[PDB]
Amino acid sequence: MEKDLLDKLGQHLVWRMGRAEDEDVLVVRVGLASATPRFRELPRLLNLPEAEMRRLVQEGRVRVEWVEE
Amino acid sequence: MEKDLLDKLGQHLVWRMGRAEDEDVLVVRVGLASATPRFRELPRLLNLPEAEMRRLVQEGRVRVEWVEE
Secondary structure: OHHHHHHHOOOOEEEEEEEOOOOOOEEEEEEEHHHHHHHOOOOOOEOOOHHHHHHHHHOOOEEEEEOOO | OHHHHHHHOOOOEEEEEEEOOOOOOEEEEEEEHHHHHHHOOOOOOEOOOHHHHHHHHHOOOEEEEEOOO
16 A cells, blocks of 8 residues: 555655636646645645546546645 | 545545556546445555656656546
8 A cells, every 4th residue: 555655654645636727627736745835836726526526537637746845 | 625625524535546557657546435445346556656656647647546436
């Protein structure tokens, strides 16, 4: 299990998600815990119902983004 | 914040990730907490260094998967 592996290295990943503000796309942002401050600086994502999230993942309308610390 | 929104609905999302066994692709699997049992039934993913994960996300070699409960 990946989370466990990272736990053993003292590493933790930060996850944030939501819909892009101007396109019908689910955005997943991921980075090391040390990059946390940068997440809030990024353009804001919108909350959305869990059903909408399922729809977007199933249609492949998802963008995963790496946030540099 | 999405996690918070879902917390208010008693909903929780399960996240698992790792590299696909036969292709250079980072796989992210997501589903409702009630779908947890199904995750372990799925083909196994491989642990990988956090640096490799960053590389894969940055090159766009990522597949997000929805796990039905």
